[model samples]
Every structure is written in structure tokens, then in C-alpha cells.
Target chain A: DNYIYSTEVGGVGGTPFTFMQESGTITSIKFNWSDQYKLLHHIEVKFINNANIYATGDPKGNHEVILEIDDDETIIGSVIGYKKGNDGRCTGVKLTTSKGKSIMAGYFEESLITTYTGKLAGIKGGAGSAIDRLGLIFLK
Target chain B: DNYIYSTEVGGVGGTPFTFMQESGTITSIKFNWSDQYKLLHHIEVKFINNANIYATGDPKGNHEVILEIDDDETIIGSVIGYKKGNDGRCTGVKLTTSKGKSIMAGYFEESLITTYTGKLAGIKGGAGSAIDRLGLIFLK
Candidate 1:
């Protein structure tokens, strides 16, 4: 069976977010922005696959994030828009890493002057924390 | 009005495709594929504010190319998915180039197979001629 997870992460100062897949297979992941909150920012997120693959966000926006996983147990991750900025709205994905580590990372920031929405859900983390602070050390 | 011109020089050795546009604002683009003519395996087309940009069967599947443009005339362009080799169907507009000379290129190698679809008007070039290629080139 295929599954999908969707949610929003708000606040500032980098909040930790995590996910845990218990069964089935992961297909795709996506993120979107809301209608309020504007400031012009960027965000980044890291993902770890079954093969222990690592992927991260490129620039970041406040629209959507999507991830695709192959049948070979391969994992590819990305980051979408999450905050408002002066530029209106932005969206896309970022995956920059090779699976190997036990943990992954994701980040976000804004620049415009509007609200945004974000959604994510496809695979689950193995253990430990899925999201951590930018400066804090991530424990496996 | 912003405009751009795209010309197919040579790929795996074949006829060169060319197109021109006056506006950089890209409305949309899409690709469709057929199994009949191996040479005409893939088709790509785009609609910008001033003109259209397009490319067809390169080497791999037709969905290897990426389309990007800006609607607000800002420095940061919008990012959209043009094609995906795995899905067998690629479409949509994504990103904008700050420089007019920046040409977006795609890779095709045969191993990647797929088609694409979306809102694309009839191209001007004849089937696969130079002028007819305007269906895909986005102007500045």
C-alpha cells in the first residue's frame, strides 16, 4: 500500500520536526504554504531513506515540497516554500545528499510579507529526532 | 516586453530546431509522446507572455527538458516541473532566468522514457521546423 503525510510547521528560531513510517511503502511527499504570514524567507529540510540516503533543501520557499521514492528502496527528498516574503510566493523541492547516514536535516526561512502553507508525509524516520535545531547537535 | 530565442543545434546528429519569443512571461508548457516514429518520440512546447519555447525528441525520453520563467519580473524566477523520466509524463513551468542568454538544457539518454501533457497552444513551426519551434521558446 502507498501512504502520504501532510502537516504544517510554524513558529520561528527553527523548530524540530520528525516523522516515523511504521508500515507499507512511501510514494511521494509534498508541501504548501498558507494565506497569511509574509516576510520573505527560505527553508531547508533533510531526509533519510531506508537505504540511509540523505537529501536536503536547496534555496527554500513557501509553496510545496515533494519527494519521490523508487521501488528499489531508493529515497529522494526535497524542501518546499513555508514562509511569506516580499516576493509574493515561491515553491519547489531540494534534495542534496546520498543515503548513508542514520539522520537527515530540513530547514526553512521567509522574505516576503504573506502567509504560507507547508505539507510533508511519505516515509517515516527510523528513530531519534527527525528534525533538530540548526545549531544544536543531532543525536542518532 | 521580454523575449528569448532557443535553437536546437545538434543532438546525436539530427535536424536543428529553432524558435523565438517576445515576452519572458511563460504561461505554460507540456510534452506528449508516441511510440510510432522512433525519431519523433517526444514533443515539448511552452507559452510565454511574448512567445513560445519548445524542444522535441533529443536522445533519451522527451521529458528530459526543464522549463522556467518569471511572471512578476523579479530576480528570483518561479520553479515548476517540466518533465520527469520516471513518470513517463512531464509538464508545467518552473523558474525564471535573470539573464536572457541563460539557456535551460535537458539530458536524454534512452534509458529515460516518458511523455508530458498540459495547456499548450498550437505551435507555429511546421511539425518540426525551425520557425515552427516557436511553440516552446519563451521570450524575455
Candidate 2:
């Protein structure tokens, strides 16, 4: 499986984590959001085989939402956001999948939005107290 | 992906459950064993992408073990066992992967052994409080 990794966006605050399905498909995603801080702190990725990948930062006060993708759907794009400066910790995300299905969370205002498109294979990032950085891992 | 589902073995006492990775690989497995009954009651499948599939029957008094498969290895065969009669509930399993690595659980003594081989893909079966039946899902 030829896999391509996009440049990492946002600041580095936490340790690095990677989750990819070389020959599989991602079927769902669970996001942990901090309402007061307006930040996305944790993510749990579910693949077609019912396995999972986990990433976490600080989730002191967080809420969660699970985005389920249909069997016929494929993830095509991602939008990761972080503040202009100050460690540039990731605070928002928008994932666009097939059939116009998507899930957006956290705050995007006054943040740098990094857009990536391709056949999304998985995700890589750094996280700790809060999601520090984000990147996309895609197929060639 | 041209997938093939194996014939079901063991008894039919629980609900049907399927866990597959159409384009993925099964990386690891967790088994729940009933020492007193010499039976395998549950199984948790982990794929390369960190997703999981769960199957269970009666794990009331079971011991658990997580079998870890390497990234470079591949699953090649399986040995599922059950009694000659009495609903044919599954009592044992032996999975053979690449590099001569294998995990065997439950009791095989005096049990009917059903052997299957090929490019192992995933698994399906019936489960509840205990695993009642088991099947292999493989690549064509």
C-alpha cells in the first residue's frame, strides 16, 4: 500500500500519534471537544474492521460526538484549524466524506485552516493537554 | 475486493455477528476462555488500523488473552473445534499466522476440528454471553 503523509500543521505540544489503515477504510470518527476552550482535544478513529485509533490531548471538560460514515462512502477532504500563533495548538476540524456527509467541531474563527484532499488513509498528529497539531495521511 | 465467507462451525445459540476489513488485514486477536468448560467464549479482533470486532457467548467465568500479530506477518490458517454433538458449540481455536507464530486456546481433546486455510481476512459468527459458533472470512 503506497501511503502519503501531508505536512503537519499547527504547533507541537503533545507527543506524536499515528493511525492508518494501509489497505482498509476508515468508517467512523469520534471527536472529543472542549466547549469552554473551543478546542478539539481527543479523537478516536474507527476503521471498517471495527478496530480503532486513539489520540488525546487535554480533555478536562470535553464533549464527544461520533461521526459514522456509510458503507459506500469515502473520506475525501479535511480542514484542520489552529490559532495564528502562541504554539498554534489545533482547535477545530472539518472532515468531508462522500454523499455530502461531514462533521465540524471546535472554533475556526481567527485560526489558520489547513485543507487537504485525497483518498484519506488515516491521521497523524501531536496531542497532550489539547490537540497540538494535525496532519493527514492519504493514499497515492 | 472479492471476499469469501467460510462455512459456520460450532453451534447456533447466539446472535449473528460479522467483522471484516474488505481491504484491510487482521492484526491481532483477544480470546476469552472458560477453563472449567474448556471452551472459548469470546473473541476481539484487531485490525492494522486499530479498529476492532467483538464476538462473545458466555464469558461468565473466562480468562482472557490478547494475541499480538506483527505488522509484517499475515494470517494463513485457523483450527476451530467443537464437540461431535450437543449443539456443536465451539470449544477451541488455533490461529496460524506468518513466521510460524500462532495462538491456541480452549480444549481440543475429543473435539471435532475444522481446519481452514487461505489469506485470512476477518471473522463472523454467533455470540451472546458465550461464543456459540465461528466462521472465517477470507480473500478470494
Candidate 3:
């Protein structure tokens, strides 16, 4: 039984908050990516809405601190394009945030597709627990 | 200068539907997961929506072949989920479906955190075009 929990809500402004799942449901929600001098600079998240879902990319220009969004409104979005590992078709994760104002989530939509066969587990590998807490949540 | 378009209105579907790069605005969606026959089948997804977004785990379970959903309701939901690696908290997303009846979306929420300095681009890696084509939309 694996578990994970998180807490972080908004920046400068505060009001909306929901974070829980530090234990199973495959540890619910977790996201990380913030390298100081070396750069990567931002992208950190944690969730547990009974279970919630999300993903993003191809949000060009990038602007909005408190929150601004598109792509049918991104509950779990991933269009493609960015950074350029090469070839014009960047495949996944555009992960860009700036200007400060943290914790943003307002508009939302849902689409469900289910498939099962015995035990399939929650959040497995490929960056589970957002890489297992990444240096303990960007330790300083 | 890039483009991708999709429309099904129904089961089950994303880059995972063309994975585009439309100039840029929010450009943020990233998800990853896929296992060969050796390590069990797994497909999980999150969300980001304003313009568009979607992904569906291979489903056909519990007989909902015709489609019936919960948490406000969804018929062919792509929220994605299944079984456990532990506890009994496998909440939200049981990605299991079959039969006909489609178009399911509810609860619907969207929140986008912004942070940018320069050149963010779009969808980056880990197989976005949802493994590209996936046998041409489940073929007729």
C-alpha cells in the first residue's frame, strides 16, 4: 500500500484549496519540476479529488498568473509542441507557468473511458508520485 | 504554424487524437503510460481544457457496454482508472466500458497555473499523439 499527501494553494491570494491522498488510491495527486539556477523553473502540483485528472501543452505565448486556460478547458490536456527536442511535433507536456500567482484551477470538463482486467493499480511508474517527491518537493 | 483536428462525439478516444502546435496560448498538457504485453496494460490520464482535451484507457469492463457513469455522470468517459496496488480508496475513474450509448461529461472543472519567461512551445514527449493513431480510431 503506497501513499502520498500534498498541500499548496494559491499565491498572494488565497481561498480555494483541496489536497489529499498521501496514502494509496496510488497516492492520488502529485506533480513536480522546479530547478533554480539550472533552469526548468516551474511546474509543481499535487491533488486528490476522490481523484482528479490533468495534462497540458501547446498553450503558446504563455500568460496568466492567477490562471488562464484553453484546449476545451484542460482538465487533462495535452496537445503538443514546445522546447524542441527536435522535429516540429513536440509530443507531450508543455508545462509552462510564470509571473508569480500560484494555485490556479477553475474551468473544467470530464471525459471518462474505462478498461480493466484484474489488478491494474494507480499511478504506476513513468513518473509516479511525480518522481517520488522529487528531492522532497524541491528541497532547499 | 501547425494544425490538428478531431471530432467523434462518442467511446472513447486524443494525439492520443494529432497532437498539435497551434502557435501558442496555454500550451500545457502532458501524460504518459504504456506497457508491452509483458507488464500489464495501463493507461491513465489527467486534464487541461479550454479549447480541447482527451484520452481513454482501453476499456470494456463491468458490461456497461451501452455506457453508464457516475459522479454527475459520463457515458464514454476518458477520465481513466482501475484496480489497486493497495488500499480500498481507488476513487474516481473506473475506466470500464462497452456497447453503445456515448457522450458523457460532468462536474467539469478547469484550473491553469501560468509561469513563463520565454519559449515554452508545446507538448514535449512520452508518446503524445496517444501513441499515434492507435489503429486508426479503433477501426470500424
Name the top TM-score candidate. Answer: 2
CAPRI grade, predicted model 2 = incorrect
lDDT of 1 by residue, A1-140 (tens): 23322212222233233433444333443333322432222333334345433333232334544445343433222233222212122322333223421222232332111111112223221111121111111111
True contacts kept of each: 0.00, 0.00, 0.00
**What is the clash count for each candidate, in the order shown?**
93, 16, 91
- Which of the two candidates, 1 or 3, achieves a greater TM-score against the reference? 1
Summarize candidate 2's per-residue lDDT along B16-129 as a digit string, tens digits: 887776477677777888887877777888787755554455557557777677766655545566643337667777777767777878876543332334466787878876
**Per-residue lDDT for B5-121 in model 3, tens only?**
111221122223333333332222222322221111112222222345433333322111111111122223234222222111111211212322132211112211112222222
Query: Candidate 3, overall lDDT?
Result: 0.21
Query: Which prediction has the highest lDDT against the true structure?
Result: 2
Error of 1 at A75 (Å): 23
Candidates ranked by TM-score: 2, 1, 3
Question: Is candidate 2 or 3 superior in DockQ?
Answer: 3
Tell the DockQ for candidate 1.
Answer: 0.01
lDDT of 1 by residue, B75-97 (tens): 23432222222222222223333
